[PDB]
Symmetry: C3
Amino acid sequence: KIEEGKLVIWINGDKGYNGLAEVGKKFEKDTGIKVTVEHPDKLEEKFPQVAATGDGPDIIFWAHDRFGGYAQSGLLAEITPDKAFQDKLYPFTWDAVRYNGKLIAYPIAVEALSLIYNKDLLPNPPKTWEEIPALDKELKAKGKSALMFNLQEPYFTWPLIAADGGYAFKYENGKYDIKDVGVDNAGAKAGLTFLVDLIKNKHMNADTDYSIAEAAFNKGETAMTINGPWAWSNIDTSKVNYGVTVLPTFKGQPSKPFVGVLSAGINAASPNKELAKEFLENYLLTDEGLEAVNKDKPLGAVALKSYEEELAKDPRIAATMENAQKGEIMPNIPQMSAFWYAVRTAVINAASGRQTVDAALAAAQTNAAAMATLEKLMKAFESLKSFQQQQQQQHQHQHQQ
Amino acid sequence: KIEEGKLVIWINGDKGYNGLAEVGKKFEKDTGIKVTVEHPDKLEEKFPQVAATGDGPDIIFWAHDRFGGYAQSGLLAEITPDKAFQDKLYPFTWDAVRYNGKLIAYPIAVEALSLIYNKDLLPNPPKTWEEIPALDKELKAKGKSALMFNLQEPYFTWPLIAADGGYAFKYENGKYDIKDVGVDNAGAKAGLTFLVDLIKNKHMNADTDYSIAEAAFNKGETAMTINGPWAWSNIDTSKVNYGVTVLPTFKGQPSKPFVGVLSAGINAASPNKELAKEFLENYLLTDEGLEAVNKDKPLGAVALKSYEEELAKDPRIAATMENAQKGEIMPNIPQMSAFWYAVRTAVINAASGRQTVDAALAAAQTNAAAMATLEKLMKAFESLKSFQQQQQQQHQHQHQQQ
Amino acid sequence: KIEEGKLVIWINGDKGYNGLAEVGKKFEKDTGIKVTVEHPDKLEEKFPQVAATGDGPDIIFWAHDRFGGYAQSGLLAEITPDKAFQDKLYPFTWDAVRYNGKLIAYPIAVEALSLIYNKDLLPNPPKTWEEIPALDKELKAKGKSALMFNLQEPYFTWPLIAADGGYAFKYENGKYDIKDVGVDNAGAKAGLTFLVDLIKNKHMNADTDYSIAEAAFNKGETAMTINGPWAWSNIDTSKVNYGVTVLPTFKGQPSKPFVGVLSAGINAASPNKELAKEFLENYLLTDEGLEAVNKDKPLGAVALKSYEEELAKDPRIAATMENAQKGEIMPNIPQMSAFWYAVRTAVINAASGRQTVDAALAAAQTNAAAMATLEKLMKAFESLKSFQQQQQQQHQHQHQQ
Ligand SMILES: [Ca+2]
Ligand SMILES: [Zn+2]
Ligand SMILES: [Zn+2]
Ligand SMILES: [Zn+2]
Ligand SMILES: [Zn+2]
Ligand SMILES: [Zn+2]
Ligand SMILES: [Zn+2]
Ligand SMILES: [Zn+2]
Ligand SMILES: [Zn+2]
Ligand SMILES: [Zn+2]
Ligand SMILES: [Zn+2]
Ligand SMILES: [Zn+2]
Ligand SMILES: [Zn+2]
Ligand SMILES: [Zn+2]
Ligand SMILES: [Zn+2]
Ligand SMILES: [Zn+2]
Ligand SMILES: [Zn+2]
Ligand SMILES: [Zn+2]
Ligand SMILES: [Zn+2]
Ligand SMILES: [Zn+2]
Ligand SMILES: [Zn+2]
Ligand SMILES: [Zn+2]
Ligand SMILES: [Zn+2]
Ligand SMILES: [Zn+2]
Ligand SMILES: [Zn+2]
Ligand SMILES: [Zn+2]
Ligand SMILES: [Zn+2]
Ligand SMILES: [Zn+2]
Ligand SMILES: [Zn+2]
Ligand SMILES: [Zn+2]
Ligand SMILES: [Zn+2]
Ligand SMILES: [Zn+2]
Ligand SMILES: [Zn+2]
Ligand SMILES: [Zn+2]
Ligand SMILES: [Zn+2]
């Protein structure tokens, strides 16, 4: 149920879909083609099912990392924007929407971790990681702590680990090299050691999670926290005078958080590919098009240079973009599952004292190959099931041989 | 123990073994060496078992795809024909008998898919795939269908898929590259799209198998079919005036069917390697030698250039050879099991509408990796079993270690 | 917990720990740093367990092949000896203590297979393998056999196999190549063929193991045997007049036995890295240092050039070194487990007549890959077990949550 001569668009419920419909309303007035915007529950899981059969939306809006799995399954169509339109967006955002050399989606919004500080407790935020231990002792005299952030998830701790030479997958020649993993290098060694040093010197607690860290900052117990744009609304409600700035540097090198890019992909089964190209390139990815969506729900930092400069007036957004350009793009390959599994264990075991930094990171490459073996055989058996599925419609109590 | 001084040959029961024995009788008259020709049941399965221990025949006759398995186990010997003898057979036939660079067998016969048409219904067969949809609805006015062939097996559907650039594995410098798979490329994409287009436009049924297609052509219900030389005898009995020609062209490019080559391999355990070479090169692979075998049971297209030119006077055999030269050789590598499994699913799902052309072909590497892992497990546990036999036969209940 | 200021060393119970303690006593007198030498049971098993948490010894003594697993886990520290000190030891010994390019331990002793002959029965030992069948016929008239050695283990049979062209994995500039396996090549083919020829010509029995071979030589039933320095003491007790010489040559090429190197590795978690370097380079690896250890329990051949020449005056030790230089270093890579499993089966089957030489070596790639995936399985399920247990003890309700 695609239906040619019209566009049906899928976008998550927490996004500005009403403003997107306004863009589609503008699109209808110029070309005479109606645009329907739908927001079904769990559309990221519904899409691969329906798009395989040849159904689903013409355009889908989701994070770029999930789009890699779609392009693997051949559900997304290769987009054809020329050199001039590619210059309209930030050059790095184009790397997020790439699979097997081909461009598969249009970058819309950019999301990344930033440093959030209490202005009343600390009007001058630190530029380096190394001055935070010294800052903690000075704030402990006033019954406060310098920095509290989520330590359970690798996503939050990676900016430090990365900062000086850490890397999950080496991005070279428009592709990720799965044979080159930078979790066991000297840069990642130093970053995690510094984090562990912060813990054993009582500057941070190893048991700290999202709930503990958010509550601590919103009550004004800690001076600084590391969080994304999604948490801004909760800090606004707590009346806390907060600022958002660039992440602290480690060994003179900037922190490298993972970059999440909200993207627009065209279904491969769609017979409205050139119409989707017209809508996305010339109606949505313009100053008006993004403004209409942003006013319904804030898009944060955007991929379009012209409108990003406009939004930059908000220093929070400017910091989101600055950390993103200093960070690295979330790899869209399936091998990322094994990476998260390995690094999560690595960080937890290093922080708790179960394993040393050198040993915890070394075991990560072993543990990553382990998840790979489980996954490579996980889908080997679901394939065996599907082979015996067809062996029931060919030769049975209905037709033999 | 394969008893030196004489030759023992294994060849399938459906082949011209009596004619081969006549070649052996001629060999015995010139050199004084007796030649035994045997045709045991399931000899393709019996060979790896007895050849490993040091037994079995001196020479074995089978299709080349099974010979890649025998070469892996090191059951076949490396043959040494000179440049002069290699020019006697078609250059491409030597690519079928190559494993790890070394030549392992002698090419004898050549099998490939061809286009078979009803002369009474259609005297002028289409040269392109693109003109078949238009030709169908003309024949549908007379209550007939243009083309009906097996769509369940990938072997039959591959010629179209391969045509524009699909491939199994890249063949370079006499070596297959298992990392270079061409099922997901644009050439294979267009081939399958056209096939799916034919089905949804009611020109073909998605659930058409071998039997339905064979029965339809033999009763004169369909104008065309795609099949090999093995099915000719059934069309002969049906009294249908049939012709065999080259496969249709897709996008100006020829169809590429897989080429099966009947080959003669020499056992590595054989003490009569010179006598096997002498018999195969100077006695069998001559006009006389192949004549005797062909008269007992037809070989189809042959590897020998001189005898093929004589057989090409039969327009059916000339068509089988023409399709083979245009097509690709069936890879002899073990990765082919994974290939067939994945492509079969890909085509079936694309034809039925379970998956789009793009999605079905994309899932092929994922489906091929499934067999790969499953074959690894299959040989992993059978290795563990035969290991535990070593530690229970040798080392227990009557001994400790020895 | 590795205390600082002092040194603690782990070395196996069957080694000269008392002599090593004397070196530590000398170290204490010059520097004022006390050295403790401990010999705990199954220290090779205990080291990976305690060194991962940050405990264990400062220095560990074991065979180099086990150290490859330690370097993978990041339990060993990279040693820093200059070019001048590297020239003090035999060049090849440094290749045994190398992992991923880095040097991970100090070579101490060298252990290799040698040809042991009864000089009463045979004063002139054969220099070639080819002349052994002719020698057996002469000795069978006197009711004796020419050669009897272990055939059940590949370690003993490999020297013959390797000599013409066999190799487990190709050693290059950096490390080992796990793709290039030389078990199926022509050189290894010929080597095993000759061994099978010896068995079917009734010169050797396929059922001969370590016990049968040792007993036959110590009673004086067989003229020759192939064994290491470990068996010398048993031949001493039997009063048999015996000599140790170079292994016979096959096709003019020397027999290539695997070389075992006893090595001293520094713990990565050690706070005494310079002190360990000082102790090992300047105190142990000297004429004086090794002599003390050698006098407690013999080291056999040594890595140090100066002390080896002095020990070479023993014809048995000089022969062990000569075979080692002609032979090949035992690979420290984990892929070796699969190699042993495959070759063990290949040789046994070829010797019993169960398979031909060609079919035996060809099947080796199959059962080597079979083990490879079988190890990947038990490694993968280790991860699952430790993951599901780590998430429960750190995430649950009952008694918590
Ligand atoms: Ca401090
Ligand atoms: Zn709809
Ligand atoms: Zn909804
Ligand atoms: Zn549909
Ligand atoms: Zn993500
Ligand atoms: Zn590179
Ligand atoms: Zn401090
Ligand atoms: Zn502006
Ligand atoms: Zn402005
Ligand atoms: Zn027979
Ligand atoms: Zn075949
Ligand atoms: Zn000739
Ligand atoms: Zn039509
Ligand atoms: Zn092909
Ligand atoms: Zn190529
Ligand atoms: Zn070429
Ligand atoms: Zn070429
Ligand atoms: Zn290629
Ligand atoms: Zn029907
Ligand atoms: Zn049938
Ligand atoms: Zn003739
Ligand atoms: Zn070709
Ligand atoms: Zn002194
Ligand atoms: Zn001194
Ligand atoms: Zn102790
Ligand atoms: Zn002890
Ligand atoms: Zn003899
Ligand atoms: Zn015994
Ligand atoms: Zn014993
Ligand atoms: Zn001294
Ligand atoms: Zn001294
Ligand atoms: Zn001395
Ligand atoms: Zn060497
Ligand atoms: Zn809970
Ligand atoms: Zn309980």
